[PDB]
Design an enzyme around this catalytic site. Structure first.
Site, PDB file in Angstrom:
ATOM      1  N   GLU A  45       0.802  -1.199   0.000  1.00  0.00           N
ATOM      2  CA  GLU A  45       0.000   0.000   0.000  1.00  0.00           C
ATOM      3  C   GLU A  45       0.844   1.263   0.000  1.00  0.00           C
ATOM      4  O   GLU A  45       1.704   1.481   0.888  1.00  0.00           O
ATOM      5  CB  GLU A  45      -0.999  -0.022   1.207  1.00  0.00           C
ATOM      6  N   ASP A  84       0.484   5.426   0.051  1.00  0.00           N
ATOM      7  CA  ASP A  84      -0.388   6.551   0.322  1.00  0.00           C
ATOM      8  C   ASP A  84       0.356   7.732  -0.216  1.00  0.00           C
ATOM      9  O   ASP A  84       1.261   8.287   0.450  1.00  0.00           O
ATOM     10  CB  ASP A  84      -0.600   6.756   1.855  1.00  0.00           C
ATOM     11  N   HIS A  94       1.331   8.921   6.223  1.00  0.00           N
ATOM     12  CA  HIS A  94      -0.058   8.683   6.652  1.00  0.00           C
ATOM     13  C   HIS A  94      -0.782   9.993   6.787  1.00  0.00           C
ATOM     14  O   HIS A  94      -0.600  10.731   7.777  1.00  0.00           O
ATOM     15  CB  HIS A  94      -0.142   7.902   7.968  1.00  0.00           C
ATOM     16  N   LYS A 152      -3.215  -0.845  -8.634  1.00  0.00           N
ATOM     17  CA  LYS A 152      -4.573  -0.884  -8.152  1.00  0.00           C
ATOM     18  C   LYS A 152      -4.861   0.502  -7.695  1.00  0.00           C
ATOM     19  O   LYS A 152      -4.053   1.135  -6.995  1.00  0.00           O
ATOM     20  CB  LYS A 152      -4.686  -1.780  -6.951  1.00  0.00           C
ATOM     21  N   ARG A 188     -10.429  -6.819  -0.782  1.00  0.00           N
ATOM     22  CA  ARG A 188      -9.394  -6.354   0.093  1.00  0.00           C
ATOM     23  C   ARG A 188      -9.983  -6.010   1.415  1.00  0.00           C
ATOM     24  O   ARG A 188     -11.007  -5.382   1.474  1.00  0.00           O
ATOM     25  CB  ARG A 188      -8.761  -5.083  -0.459  1.00  0.00           C
ATOM     26  N   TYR A 202       6.505 -18.670  31.698  1.00  0.00           N
ATOM     27  CA  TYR A 202       5.560 -18.377  32.734  1.00  0.00           C
ATOM     28  C   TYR A 202       6.066 -17.436  33.801  1.00  0.00           C
ATOM     29  O   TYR A 202       7.226 -17.497  34.219  1.00  0.00           O
ATOM     30  CB  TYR A 202       5.072 -19.644  33.366  1.00  0.00           C
TER      31      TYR A 202
END
Ligand SMILES: O=P(O)(O)O[C@H]1[C@@H](O)[C@H](O)[C@@H](OP(=O)(O)O)[C@H](OP(=O)(O)O)[C@H]1O
Ligand SMILES: [Ca+2]
Ligand SMILES: [Ca+2]
Ligand SMILES: [Ca+2]
EC number: 3.1.4.11
Length: 513
Positions: A142, A144, A157, A239, A306, A464
């Site tokens: 992706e 942007d 972003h 895309k 998607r 643990y």
């Protein structure tokens, strides 16, 4: 003593015990005996002397026994710790599926805001982030895109304080790594926020950088369906939205026209063209799955969907991919930067098929007329109940998970089943106090899995802590059909998906219909 030591620090009864049973009274394993082991315990298909030999030729340390076509305890072990004795099917670790069906028939390895290295609000962006994803096998990335200074488009972003990077810089990186992990097609999901000029710039950078890798013209033929991963080998598709939008770019979108979800065609003939792909948030997706499970599934047969993380995930946390895969969704995007069970599962799934990034969906999810709905299970091909028994015998050289001191792990193991909601389960061993070198649990669990073709089995080892939360030590996720039977070692990975050299779990697996 110091002989005994090493010969004692190196002393695995479970292994001994196992050799004995297979070797009976003999000090070695004759082919005949080995083959029996392979067939009865390791439930091998190609079981036969041919394999039995290969193992010996491959793993037998002794020259005598090697030459004499025999296996020693040592060679037994070596095999057990080899790629051949891995619980994750060595055969599935190479592209071995049908790579000629339309993309929509494969689950694709996808990421979310790939440029991101950390959180979604103020974390840094970096080309490194695209390199890492690509190296981890990711196929759909992706970008942007936003206008930047000097007429050079940038990537960050939108509307947050996330560090910025250059679109071109990113393209180069993608250029260099696109196929390091696989020869299969890479899809760039563009999220365009660029002024028409900067969009023109992008288009240039695209052709200038991607050059011939870039797919800027439909494939000859390829008329009623998306091309297959094969036909698209070594190519990079775009895309985005296709005709605010300059033709230079738009003209570049060929098989992935970003569209707003209409609905599922059923109440008609069509809805979205095979070359149309809608995106759904994690939330919306769940809704549609909750209400129109079969709706989706049938839709996803010939179309690509998607899905991306809910907006509240500013910490870049991830959701469970399984839920989406169960609906046939193929481009399930996660924050690949993610350590966590979600990525653990995601990368275990994609470890399959040689990690080429495209994994063929089960047949019932490739049948346009399916009546499947993981939420409303009815009899059908997908219904194939199995009985899984996993015995957690012992663990070897568990990594000292990041303790700011000199304390010993107190390991415990968790075995989980991920799949349709009905199959989902989890069980845990007890804790072994202060032992990471050779903890021994010898505990067994059983699971009933009704839709195995959608299951994955996960092994997780925790340190643990009475007080605080237990430290994750290692993990491994094996798709159901790559799960080898018998005595095997589970090779543990770090939270980062890194391979821990000698960190393993020795288990015994059996699957019976
Ligand atoms: O988390 P982000 O940075 O918000 O982006 C996500 C989404 O909110 C954004 O609105 C979508 O673009 P969209 O606004 O074009 O729907 C992107 O999906 P898409 O490119 O598949 O559609 C998603 O990956
Ligand atoms: Ca985005
Ligand atoms: Ca301890
Ligand atoms: Ca502890």
């Amino acid at each position: 003593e110091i002989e005994t030591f090493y010969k004692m620090l190196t002393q695995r009864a479970e292994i001994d015990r196992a050799f004995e049973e297979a070797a009976g009274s003999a000090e070695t394993l004759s082919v005949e005996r080995l083959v029996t082991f392979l067939q009865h315990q390791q439930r091998e298909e190609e079981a036969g002397p041919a394999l039995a030999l290969s193992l010996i030729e491959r793993y037998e340390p002794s020259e005598t026994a090697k030459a004499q076509r025999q296996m020693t305890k040592d060679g037994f072990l070596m095999y057990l710790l080899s790629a051949d004795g891995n619980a994750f099917s060595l055969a599935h670790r190479r592209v071995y599926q049908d790579m000629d069906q339309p993309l929509s028939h494969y689950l694709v390895s996808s990421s979310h805001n790939t440029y991101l290295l950390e959180d979604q609000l103020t974390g840094p962006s970096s080309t490194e982030a695209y390199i890492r994803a690509l190296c981890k096998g990711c196929r759909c990335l992706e970008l942007d895109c936003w206008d930047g200074p000097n007429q050079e488009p940038i990537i960050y972003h939108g509307y947050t304080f996330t560090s910025k990077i250059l679109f071109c810089d990113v393209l180069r990186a993608i250029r260099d790594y696109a196929f390091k992990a696989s020869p299969y097609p890479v899809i760039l999901s563009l999220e365009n926020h660029c002024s028409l000029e900067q969009q023109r710039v992008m288009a240039r950078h695209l052709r200038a950088i991607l050059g011939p890798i870039l797919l800027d013209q439909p494939l000859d033929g390829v008329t009623t369906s998306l091309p297959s991963p094969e036909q698209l080998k070594g190519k990079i598709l775009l895309k985005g939205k296709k005709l605010k939008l300059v033709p230079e770019l738009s003209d570049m979108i060929i098989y992935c026209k970003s569209v707003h979800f209409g609905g599922f065609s059923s109440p008609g003939t069509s809805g979205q063209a095979f070359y149309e792909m809608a995106s759904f948030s994690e939330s919306r997706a769940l809704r549609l799955l909750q209400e129109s499970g079969n709706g989706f599934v049938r839709h996803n047969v010939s179309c690509l969907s998607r899905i991306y993380p809910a907006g509240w995930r500013t910490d870049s946390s991830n959701y469970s991919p399984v839920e989406m895969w169960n609906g046939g969704c193929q481009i399930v995007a996660l924050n690949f930067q993610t350590p966590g069970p979600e990525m653990d599962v995601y990368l275990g799934c994609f470890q399959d098929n040689g990690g080429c990034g495209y994994v063929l969906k089960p047949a019932f999810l490739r049948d346009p007329n399916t009546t499947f709905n993981s939420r409303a299970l009815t009899q059908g091909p997908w219904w194939r109940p199995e009985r899984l028994r996993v015995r957690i015998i012992s663990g070897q050289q568990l990594p000292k998970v990041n303790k700011n001191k000199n304390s010993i792990v107190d390991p415990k193991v968790i075995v989980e089943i991920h799949g349709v909601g009905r199959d989902t389960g989890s069980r845990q061993t007890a804790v072994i106090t202060n032992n990471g070198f050779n903890p021994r649990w010898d505990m067994e669990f059983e699971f009933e899995v009704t839709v195995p073709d959608l299951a994955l089995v996960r092994f997780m080892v925790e340190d643990y802590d009475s007080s605080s939360k237990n430290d994750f030590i290692g993990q491994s996720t094996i798709p159901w059909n790559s799960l080898k039977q018998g005595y095997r070692h589970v090779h543990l990975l770090s939270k980062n998906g890194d391979q821990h050299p000698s960190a393993t779990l020795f288990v015994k697996i059996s699957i019976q219909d």
